[PDB]
mmCIF file of C-alpha atoms in Angstrom:
data_model
loop_
_atom_site.group_PDB
_atom_site.id
_atom_site.type_symbol
_atom_site.label_atom_id
_atom_site.label_comp_id
_atom_site.label_asym_id
_atom_site.label_seq_id
_atom_site.Cartn_x
_atom_site.Cartn_y
_atom_site.Cartn_z
ATOM 1 C CA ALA A 1 -5.752 -34.069 16.392
ATOM 2 C CA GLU A 2 -9.475 -32.285 15.324
ATOM 3 C CA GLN A 3 -11.624 -30.513 17.590
ATOM 4 C CA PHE A 4 -14.369 -31.321 16.317
ATOM 5 C CA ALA A 5 -15.948 -33.611 13.040
ATOM 6 C CA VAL A 6 -16.836 -30.917 9.758
ATOM 7 C CA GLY A 7 -21.021 -30.528 9.557
ATOM 8 C CA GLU A 8 -21.313 -31.715 14.115
ATOM 9 C CA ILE A 9 -24.344 -30.272 16.277
ATOM 10 C CA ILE A 10 -23.143 -28.841 19.746
ATOM 11 C CA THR A 11 -24.666 -27.978 22.501
ATOM 12 C CA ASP A 12 -23.607 -24.312 24.115
ATOM 13 C CA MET A 13 -24.707 -24.490 28.683
ATOM 14 C CA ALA A 14 -27.695 -22.908 27.279
ATOM 15 C CA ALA A 15 -28.683 -25.503 25.427
ATOM 16 C CA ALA A 16 -28.220 -23.303 23.032
ATOM 17 C CA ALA A 17 -27.123 -25.830 19.675
ATOM 18 C CA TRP A 18 -24.773 -24.331 17.056
ATOM 19 C CA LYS A 19 -23.243 -26.184 13.469
ATOM 20 C CA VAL A 20 -19.332 -26.576 13.229
ATOM 21 C CA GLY A 21 -17.851 -25.389 10.050
ATOM 22 C CA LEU A 22 -14.609 -25.108 7.898
ATOM 23 C CA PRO A 23 -11.734 -23.141 9.302
ATOM 24 C CA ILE A 24 -11.858 -19.407 8.654
ATOM 25 C CA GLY A 25 -5.558 -20.560 16.517
ATOM 26 C CA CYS A 26 -8.575 -23.203 15.969
ATOM 27 C CA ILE A 27 -11.081 -20.935 14.857
ATOM 28 C CA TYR A 28 -13.741 -21.988 12.844
ATOM 29 C CA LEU A 29 -17.296 -21.339 11.313
ATOM 30 C CA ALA A 30 -20.295 -21.733 13.481
ATOM 31 C CA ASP A 31 -23.507 -21.049 12.267
ATOM 32 C CA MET A 32 -27.069 -21.872 14.243
ATOM 33 C CA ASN A 33 -28.610 -25.599 13.970
ATOM 34 C CA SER A 34 -30.268 -26.378 10.341
ATOM 35 C CA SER A 35 -30.817 -29.180 7.161
ATOM 36 C CA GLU A 36 -28.198 -26.839 5.648
ATOM 37 C CA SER A 37 -24.494 -27.511 6.340
ATOM 38 C CA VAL A 38 -22.682 -24.416 7.456
ATOM 39 C CA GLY A 39 -21.328 -22.316 4.849
ATOM 40 C CA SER A 40 -18.857 -18.674 3.857
ATOM 41 C CA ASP A 41 -21.686 -16.364 4.119
ATOM 42 C CA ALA A 42 -21.741 -17.861 8.514
ATOM 43 C CA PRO A 43 -22.336 -15.321 10.953
ATOM 44 C CA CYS A 44 -20.121 -16.372 13.860
ATOM 45 C CA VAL A 45 -17.010 -18.223 15.239
ATOM 46 C CA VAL A 46 -16.128 -20.828 17.231
ATOM 47 C CA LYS A 47 -13.204 -20.752 18.523
ATOM 48 C CA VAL A 48 -11.565 -24.301 20.581
ATOM 49 C CA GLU A 49 -8.691 -25.156 23.107
ATOM 50 C CA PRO A 50 -7.467 -27.287 25.168
ATOM 51 C CA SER A 51 -9.561 -26.531 29.194
ATOM 52 C CA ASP A 52 -6.628 -26.016 30.753
ATOM 53 C CA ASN A 53 -6.067 -23.062 28.345
ATOM 54 C CA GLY A 54 -5.230 -20.282 30.985
ATOM 55 C CA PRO A 55 -5.710 -17.553 27.329
ATOM 56 C CA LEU A 56 -9.554 -18.853 26.239
ATOM 57 C CA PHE A 57 -11.059 -19.218 29.650
ATOM 58 C CA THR A 58 -9.310 -14.659 30.454
ATOM 59 C CA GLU A 59 -11.338 -14.468 27.229
ATOM 60 C CA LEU A 60 -14.298 -16.229 27.792
ATOM 61 C CA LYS A 61 -15.119 -14.578 31.343
ATOM 62 C CA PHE A 62 -14.384 -11.299 29.982
ATOM 63 C CA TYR A 63 -17.358 -11.612 26.422
ATOM 64 C CA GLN A 64 -19.706 -13.586 30.309
ATOM 65 C CA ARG A 65 -19.550 -9.984 32.019
ATOM 66 C CA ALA A 66 -18.844 -7.641 28.504
ATOM 67 C CA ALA A 67 -19.586 -9.232 25.763
ATOM 68 C CA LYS A 68 -23.733 -10.094 26.220
ATOM 69 C CA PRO A 69 -25.896 -8.697 23.323
ATOM 70 C CA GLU A 70 -28.510 -7.278 25.862
ATOM 71 C CA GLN A 71 -25.831 -5.726 27.146
ATOM 72 C CA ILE A 72 -23.835 -3.817 23.936
ATOM 73 C CA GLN A 73 -26.848 -3.329 22.850
ATOM 74 C CA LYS A 74 -28.200 -0.494 26.238
ATOM 75 C CA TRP A 75 -25.207 0.552 25.443
ATOM 76 C CA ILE A 76 -25.531 2.033 22.113
ATOM 77 C CA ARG A 77 -28.353 3.487 22.564
ATOM 78 C CA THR A 78 -28.254 4.980 26.453
ATOM 79 C CA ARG A 79 -24.807 6.362 24.829
ATOM 80 C CA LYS A 80 -26.150 7.405 21.369
ATOM 81 C CA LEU A 81 -23.566 4.942 18.722
ATOM 82 C CA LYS A 82 -24.121 4.094 15.626
ATOM 83 C CA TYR A 83 -22.713 1.086 16.745
ATOM 84 C CA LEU A 84 -19.742 -0.608 18.924
ATOM 85 C CA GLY A 85 -16.964 -1.999 18.052
ATOM 86 C CA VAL A 86 -16.606 -5.240 20.815
ATOM 87 C CA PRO A 87 -17.933 -8.493 19.284
ATOM 88 C CA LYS A 88 -20.474 -10.588 20.494
ATOM 89 C CA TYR A 89 -20.708 -13.490 22.988
ATOM 90 C CA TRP A 90 -22.961 -15.801 21.500
ATOM 91 C CA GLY A 91 -22.710 -18.883 23.970
ATOM 92 C CA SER A 92 -19.749 -21.361 25.504
ATOM 93 C CA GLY A 93 -19.031 -25.119 26.598
ATOM 94 C CA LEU A 94 -17.030 -28.355 27.445
ATOM 95 C CA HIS A 95 -16.587 -30.534 24.693
ATOM 96 C CA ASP A 96 -15.002 -34.156 25.229
ATOM 97 C CA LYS A 97 -12.903 -35.546 22.516
ATOM 98 C CA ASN A 98 -9.970 -37.757 22.153
ATOM 99 C CA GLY A 99 -10.779 -37.680 26.140
ATOM 100 C CA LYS A 100 -9.777 -34.421 26.399
ATOM 101 C CA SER A 101 -12.013 -32.160 27.527
ATOM 102 C CA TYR A 102 -11.895 -28.279 25.526
ATOM 103 C CA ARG A 103 -13.114 -25.486 25.969
ATOM 104 C CA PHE A 104 -15.184 -23.408 22.741
ATOM 105 C CA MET A 105 -16.833 -20.539 22.947
ATOM 106 C CA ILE A 106 -19.164 -18.861 19.443
ATOM 107 C CA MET A 107 -18.588 -15.446 18.649
ATOM 108 C CA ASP A 108 -19.503 -12.844 15.599
ATOM 109 C CA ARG A 109 -17.774 -13.465 12.304
ATOM 110 C CA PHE A 110 -15.265 -10.431 10.831
ATOM 111 C CA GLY A 111 -13.785 -9.789 7.925
ATOM 112 C CA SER A 112 -10.262 -9.137 6.926
ATOM 113 C CA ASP A 113 -7.632 -7.328 9.174
ATOM 114 C CA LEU A 114 -6.992 -3.836 8.976
ATOM 115 C CA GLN A 115 -3.655 -4.953 9.323
ATOM 116 C CA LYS A 116 -4.069 -6.527 5.946
ATOM 117 C CA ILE A 117 -5.364 -3.008 4.507
ATOM 118 C CA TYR A 118 -2.640 -1.178 5.821
ATOM 119 C CA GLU A 119 0.138 -2.699 4.106
ATOM 120 C CA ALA A 120 -2.500 -3.630 0.421
ATOM 121 C CA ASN A 121 -2.333 0.581 0.628
ATOM 122 C CA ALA A 122 1.990 1.089 0.969
ATOM 123 C CA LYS A 123 2.049 0.776 5.176
ATOM 124 C CA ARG A 124 -0.239 3.864 5.168
ATOM 125 C CA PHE A 125 -3.747 5.266 6.554
ATOM 126 C CA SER A 126 -5.560 8.914 5.601
ATOM 127 C CA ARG A 127 -5.943 11.434 8.479
ATOM 128 C CA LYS A 128 -9.301 11.232 8.150
ATOM 129 C CA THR A 129 -9.761 6.657 8.175
ATOM 130 C CA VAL A 130 -6.845 7.278 11.393
ATOM 131 C CA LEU A 131 -9.678 10.012 12.727
ATOM 132 C CA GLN A 132 -11.968 7.843 11.824
ATOM 133 C CA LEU A 133 -10.706 4.633 13.412
ATOM 134 C CA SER A 134 -9.601 6.766 16.467
ATOM 135 C CA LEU A 135 -12.964 8.154 18.016
ATOM 136 C CA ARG A 136 -14.488 3.991 17.061
ATOM 137 C CA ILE A 137 -11.141 2.480 19.106
ATOM 138 C CA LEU A 138 -12.379 5.437 22.236
ATOM 139 C CA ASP A 139 -15.980 4.410 22.298
ATOM 140 C CA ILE A 140 -15.145 1.024 22.586
ATOM 141 C CA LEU A 141 -12.068 1.434 25.353
ATOM 142 C CA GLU A 142 -14.521 4.091 27.473
ATOM 143 C CA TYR A 143 -16.305 0.529 27.344
ATOM 144 C CA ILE A 144 -14.518 -2.564 28.348
ATOM 145 C CA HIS A 145 -12.592 0.594 30.382
ATOM 146 C CA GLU A 146 -16.491 0.856 32.806
ATOM 147 C CA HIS A 147 -16.068 -2.240 32.428
ATOM 148 C CA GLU A 148 -13.885 -3.069 34.817
ATOM 149 C CA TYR A 149 -11.157 -4.824 31.815
ATOM 150 C CA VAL A 150 -8.440 -2.791 29.608
ATOM 151 C CA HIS A 151 -7.357 -4.822 26.943
ATOM 152 C CA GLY A 152 -3.307 -3.516 26.534
ATOM 153 C CA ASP A 153 -2.742 -5.016 22.869
ATOM 154 C CA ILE A 154 -4.793 -2.504 20.382
ATOM 155 C CA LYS A 155 -3.479 -2.770 16.647
ATOM 156 C CA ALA A 156 -4.466 -3.057 13.473
ATOM 157 C CA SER A 157 -3.623 -7.096 13.601
ATOM 158 C CA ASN A 158 -6.862 -6.854 16.522
ATOM 159 C CA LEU A 159 -8.602 -4.706 14.524
ATOM 160 C CA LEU A 160 -11.421 -6.707 12.534
ATOM 161 C CA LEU A 161 -13.926 -5.112 10.134
ATOM 162 C CA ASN A 162 -17.108 -6.302 10.174
ATOM 163 C CA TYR A 163 -18.359 -8.931 6.905
ATOM 164 C CA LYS A 164 -21.355 -6.674 5.346
ATOM 165 C CA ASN A 165 -20.290 -3.132 6.966
ATOM 166 C CA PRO A 166 -16.922 -2.207 5.847
ATOM 167 C CA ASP A 167 -16.958 1.425 8.141
ATOM 168 C CA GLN A 168 -17.432 -0.329 11.525
ATOM 169 C CA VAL A 169 -14.198 -1.485 12.839
ATOM 170 C CA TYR A 170 -14.429 -4.023 15.867
ATOM 171 C CA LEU A 171 -11.739 -5.151 18.395
ATOM 172 C CA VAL A 172 -10.856 -8.593 18.996
ATOM 173 C CA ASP A 173 -8.455 -10.580 21.470
ATOM 174 C CA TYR A 174 -9.459 -10.627 24.731
ATOM 175 C CA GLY A 175 -7.418 -13.912 25.870
ATOM 176 C CA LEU A 176 -4.752 -11.368 27.371
ATOM 177 C CA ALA A 177 -7.273 -9.120 28.624
ATOM 178 C CA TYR A 178 -6.414 -7.737 31.916
ATOM 179 C CA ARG A 179 -9.846 -6.936 34.491
ATOM 180 C CA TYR A 180 -8.004 -3.871 36.199
ATOM 181 C CA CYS A 181 -10.072 -2.764 39.049
ATOM 182 C CA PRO A 182 -12.146 -5.638 40.265
ATOM 183 C CA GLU A 183 -15.404 -4.866 41.852
ATOM 184 C CA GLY A 184 -14.254 -0.939 41.983
ATOM 185 C CA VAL A 185 -11.126 -1.579 43.583
ATOM 186 C CA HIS A 186 -8.281 -0.209 40.753
ATOM 187 C CA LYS A 187 -5.124 -2.775 41.347
ATOM 188 C CA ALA A 188 -1.753 -0.788 43.129
ATOM 189 C CA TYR A 189 1.096 0.185 40.658
ATOM 190 C CA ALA A 190 2.575 -3.262 40.805
ATOM 191 C CA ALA A 191 3.180 -6.182 39.257
ATOM 192 C CA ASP A 192 -0.060 -8.940 38.725
ATOM 193 C CA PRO A 193 1.822 -12.540 39.428
ATOM 194 C CA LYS A 194 -0.689 -14.322 37.703
ATOM 195 C CA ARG A 195 0.303 -11.559 34.045
ATOM 196 C CA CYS A 196 3.722 -12.429 32.168
ATOM 197 C CA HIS A 197 2.860 -9.862 29.390
ATOM 198 C CA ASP A 198 4.117 -6.914 28.048
ATOM 199 C CA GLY A 199 2.250 -6.288 24.962
ATOM 200 C CA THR A 200 3.299 -5.552 21.212
ATOM 201 C CA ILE A 201 7.137 -4.453 22.289
ATOM 202 C CA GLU A 202 6.671 -1.533 19.137
ATOM 203 C CA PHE A 203 3.142 -0.141 20.349
ATOM 204 C CA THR A 204 2.875 -1.719 24.482
ATOM 205 C CA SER A 205 2.315 1.567 26.465
ATOM 206 C CA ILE A 206 4.897 2.620 28.930
ATOM 207 C CA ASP A 207 3.726 1.240 32.628
ATOM 208 C CA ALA A 208 4.233 -2.472 29.647
ATOM 209 C CA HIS A 209 8.467 -1.943 30.107
ATOM 210 C CA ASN A 210 8.181 -1.120 33.206
ATOM 211 C CA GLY A 211 6.807 -4.198 34.285
ATOM 212 C CA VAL A 212 3.513 -2.200 35.929
ATOM 213 C CA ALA A 213 0.059 -4.122 35.260
ATOM 214 C CA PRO A 214 -1.734 -2.328 32.222
ATOM 215 C CA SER A 215 -3.801 0.260 33.156
ATOM 216 C CA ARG A 216 -6.018 2.811 31.232
ATOM 217 C CA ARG A 217 -3.415 5.447 30.246
ATOM 218 C CA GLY A 218 -1.754 2.433 28.444
ATOM 219 C CA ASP A 219 -4.553 2.032 25.865
ATOM 220 C CA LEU A 220 -5.152 5.408 25.268
ATOM 221 C CA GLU A 221 -1.009 4.949 25.301
ATOM 222 C CA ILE A 222 -1.406 2.322 22.485
ATOM 223 C CA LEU A 223 -4.114 4.192 20.929
ATOM 224 C CA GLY A 224 -1.582 7.304 20.545
ATOM 225 C CA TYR A 225 1.298 4.609 19.050
ATOM 226 C CA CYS A 226 -1.100 3.726 17.272
ATOM 227 C CA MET A 227 -2.070 6.249 15.194
ATOM 228 C CA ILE A 228 1.300 7.573 14.084
ATOM 229 C CA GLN A 229 2.597 4.491 12.615
ATOM 230 C CA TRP A 230 -0.688 4.273 10.279
ATOM 231 C CA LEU A 231 -0.446 8.075 9.592
ATOM 232 C CA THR A 232 3.608 7.593 8.727
ATOM 233 C CA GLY A 233 4.415 4.061 7.815
ATOM 234 C CA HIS A 234 7.090 4.027 11.011
ATOM 235 C CA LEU A 235 8.117 4.683 14.831
ATOM 236 C CA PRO A 236 11.175 6.164 16.474
ATOM 237 C CA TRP A 237 12.067 2.613 17.926
ATOM 238 C CA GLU A 238 11.031 -0.209 15.520
ATOM 239 C CA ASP A 239 14.798 -0.156 13.232
ATOM 240 C CA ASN A 240 15.683 -2.388 16.880
ATOM 241 C CA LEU A 241 12.966 -4.255 18.841
ATOM 242 C CA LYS A 242 14.843 -6.381 19.604
ATOM 243 C CA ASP A 243 15.974 -3.815 22.830
ATOM 244 C CA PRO A 244 12.806 -3.758 25.214
ATOM 245 C CA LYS A 245 14.817 -1.014 27.362
ATOM 246 C CA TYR A 246 15.713 1.149 24.130
ATOM 247 C CA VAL A 247 12.404 0.913 23.195
ATOM 248 C CA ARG A 248 11.195 1.673 26.823
ATOM 249 C CA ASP A 249 13.403 4.676 27.305
ATOM 250 C CA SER A 250 13.202 5.909 23.669
ATOM 251 C CA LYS A 251 9.035 6.178 24.877
ATOM 252 C CA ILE A 252 10.157 7.630 28.166
ATOM 253 C CA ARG A 253 12.461 10.576 26.407
ATOM 254 C CA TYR A 254 9.571 10.646 23.827
ATOM 255 C CA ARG A 255 5.945 11.317 26.272
ATOM 256 C CA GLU A 256 8.408 13.836 28.202
ATOM 257 C CA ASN A 257 8.905 16.035 25.015
ATOM 258 C CA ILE A 258 6.062 15.608 22.356
ATOM 259 C CA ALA A 259 7.344 17.711 20.260
ATOM 260 C CA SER A 260 11.218 15.940 19.963
ATOM 261 C CA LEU A 261 8.260 13.057 18.556
ATOM 262 C CA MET A 262 5.959 15.543 16.329
ATOM 263 C CA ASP A 263 9.637 16.998 14.881
ATOM 264 C CA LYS A 264 10.244 13.046 14.672
ATOM 265 C CA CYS A 265 8.122 11.293 13.097
ATOM 266 C CA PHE A 266 6.112 13.667 10.196
ATOM 267 C CA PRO A 267 8.826 16.058 8.277
ATOM 268 C CA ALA A 268 8.999 19.485 8.317
ATOM 269 C CA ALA A 269 7.806 19.870 11.678
ATOM 270 C CA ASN A 270 4.725 19.520 10.311
ATOM 271 C CA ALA A 271 2.148 17.257 12.002
ATOM 272 C CA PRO A 272 -1.354 17.122 12.589
ATOM 273 C CA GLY A 273 -1.838 19.475 16.082
ATOM 274 C CA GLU A 274 -4.995 16.431 17.216
ATOM 275 C CA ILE A 275 -2.140 13.940 17.556
ATOM 276 C CA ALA A 276 0.049 16.592 19.945
ATOM 277 C CA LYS A 277 -2.881 17.111 21.982
ATOM 278 C CA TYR A 278 -4.157 13.968 21.892
ATOM 279 C CA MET A 279 -1.374 12.469 23.369
ATOM 280 C CA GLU A 280 -0.656 15.833 25.636
ATOM 281 C CA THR A 281 -3.583 14.512 27.380
ATOM 282 C CA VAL A 282 -2.944 11.198 27.798
ATOM 283 C CA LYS A 283 0.858 12.208 29.573
ATOM 284 C CA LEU A 284 -1.353 14.201 31.890
ATOM 285 C CA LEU A 285 -3.370 10.669 33.283
ATOM 286 C CA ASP A 286 -1.740 9.055 36.149
ATOM 287 C CA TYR A 287 -1.746 5.572 36.861
ATOM 288 C CA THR A 288 -5.209 5.508 38.744
ATOM 289 C CA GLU A 289 -6.517 8.663 37.111
ATOM 290 C CA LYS A 290 -9.979 7.784 35.197
ATOM 291 C CA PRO A 291 -9.515 9.297 31.744
ATOM 292 C CA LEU A 292 -11.490 12.502 30.248
ATOM 293 C CA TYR A 293 -12.559 10.003 26.879
ATOM 294 C CA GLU A 294 -14.365 12.922 25.379
ATOM 295 C CA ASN A 295 -12.170 15.751 26.012
ATOM 296 C CA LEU A 296 -10.135 13.034 23.872
ATOM 297 C CA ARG A 297 -12.534 12.357 21.657
ATOM 298 C CA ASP A 298 -13.189 16.690 20.982
ATOM 299 C CA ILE A 299 -9.941 16.984 20.039
ATOM 300 C CA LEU A 300 -9.825 14.441 17.379
ATOM 301 C CA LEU A 301 -13.299 16.016 16.252
ATOM 302 C CA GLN A 302 -10.962 19.717 16.207
ATOM 303 C CA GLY A 303 -8.866 17.699 13.654
ATOM 304 C CA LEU A 304 -12.203 16.242 10.541
ATOM 305 C CA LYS A 305 -12.822 20.096 11.548
ATOM 306 C CA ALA A 306 -9.382 21.492 10.610
ATOM 307 C CA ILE A 307 -9.400 18.796 7.131
ATOM 308 C CA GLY A 308 -12.752 20.866 6.091
ATOM 309 C CA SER A 309 -14.364 16.707 8.246
ATOM 310 C CA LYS A 310 -17.148 15.797 10.425
ATOM 311 C CA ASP A 311 -17.347 12.435 12.308
ATOM 312 C CA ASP A 312 -19.660 10.690 9.267
ATOM 313 C CA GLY A 313 -18.698 7.474 10.510
ATOM 314 C CA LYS A 314 -16.832 6.996 7.417
ATOM 315 C CA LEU A 315 -14.010 5.072 7.346
ATOM 316 C CA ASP A 316 -12.917 6.149 3.367
ATOM 317 C CA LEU A 317 -10.546 2.337 2.943
#
């Protein structure tokens, strides 16, 4: 059952009009209403799911409260950033077709995911690339955290590049996002009954493994596993992803002894100092504690100084 007629004009709740193009779950190219039909250079995309789909409703709410174009530009101005890797929300509505109710959401369009690039580069990224990606992710993380939300699923396949600027990475898929601190009140260290997702098993946090709601330390923890995966091509527990209790156990033991993790993941006890310092700092975070994001960025910056480079914004993909 196709959601839309290709070329159809759809009007959002804000009364803005859009034309629907070919697909790029159900996602299609979208642009502002025109004489001209929607093309391969479109600037936006429309996600459409049934009205009862819980994940699209969670994603829409996150975009509505933290993704407004004006809200993002004010942040980029006051924090003096070259950009922010959070997609912009352009609009949403309800659309009836063959007597079923659907929900749609217009958002920015991006380029290829980092995972396709990772695989094309023989499952490695340079130290420069990993350091530069991580500084921008920390920016994204700080932003959504200050806006009461954690992602809990950071990974290469959820990190898209600007279709026009390959040095700018955005984080997507907020369908399973979690509002950890609604109205400024942090959730207790316990299971949220509405939530049944543990994240992606190889990258997920110890809190997620323990059936505890995702928190800010969880996101920084996840980023840490990504950095190692990207630098080395492997993770110690990759061989047996099917056993969650083993994976959890390995992460608890390697959190207790980081030097062990550096020895396992990096050849000959020679490992990037910044990755060790990163994981040490994330380890010191309690469940309800606000990370010192600037301290973490400084650590990644000491790493760029060590390889003779600076944060020039170049991902050198």
